[PDB]
């Protein structure tokens, strides 16, 4: 692609986390595209993977409640995550039953661009760091 300057500019998400925790995370990307009719993440079915939107465009869809009709259609803004719950699962140890679930379903309408990351190593990263403490603050 190009290889440049990553996203997580701002995120919150990335706020516990330390820097070396970022590139050791960063160094698990690996090199992945998303095409049309590429499901990112589907809400009730486990995560595997978490895919971490660099640059691109999605749709982002719901089944279970929603208003007036059917399926609430909606779209994400630059640098959404989706099955961000990963992220959270993996900082919780203590949660040991099967993978995460999505908020969401999103899909790939355009080609988008970004990368992949799977919770084993996230998690292995996660736990080798291991840094709360007794809730300071």
């Given at each position: 692609?190009?290889?440049?300057?990553?996203?997580?500019?701002?995120?919150?998400?990335?706020?516990?986390?330390?820097?070396?925790?970022?590139?050791?995370?960063?160094?698990r990307?690996?090199?992945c595209?998303?095409?049309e009719?590429?499901?990112?993440?589907?809400?009730?079915?486990?995560?595997?993977?978490?895919?971490?939107?660099?640059?691109?465009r999605?749709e982002?869809?719901?089944?279970?409640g929603?208003?007036?009709?059917?399926?609430?259609?909606?779209?994400l803004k630059?640098?959404?995550?989706?099955?961000?719950?990963?992220?959270?699962?993996?900082?919780?140890?203590?949660?040991?039953?099967?993978?995460?679930?999505?908020?969401?379903?999103?899909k790939?309408?355009?080609?988008?661009?970004?990368?992949?990351?799977?919770?084993?190593?996230?998690?292995?990263?996660?736990?080798?760091?291991?840094?709360?403490?007794?809730?300071?603050?």
């Open positions: 692609g190009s290889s440049g300057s990553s996203g997580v500019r701002r995120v919150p998400l990335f706020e516990n986390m330390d820097e070396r925790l970022l590139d050791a995370i960063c160094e990307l690996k090199p595209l998303f095409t009719k590429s499901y990112l993440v589907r809400e009730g079915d486990p995560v595997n993977e978490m895919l971490f939107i660099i640059r691109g999605l982002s869809v719901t089944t279970d929603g208003r007036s009709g059917f399926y609430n259609r909606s779209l630059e640098g959404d995550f989706c099955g961000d719950e990963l992220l959270t699962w993996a900082l919780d140890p203590k949660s040991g039953s099967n993978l995460p679930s999505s908020t969401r379903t999103v790939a309408l355009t080609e988008v661009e970004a990368f992949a990351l799977i919770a084993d190593e996230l998690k292995f990263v996660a736990s080798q760091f291991r840094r709360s403490g007794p809730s300071s603050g």
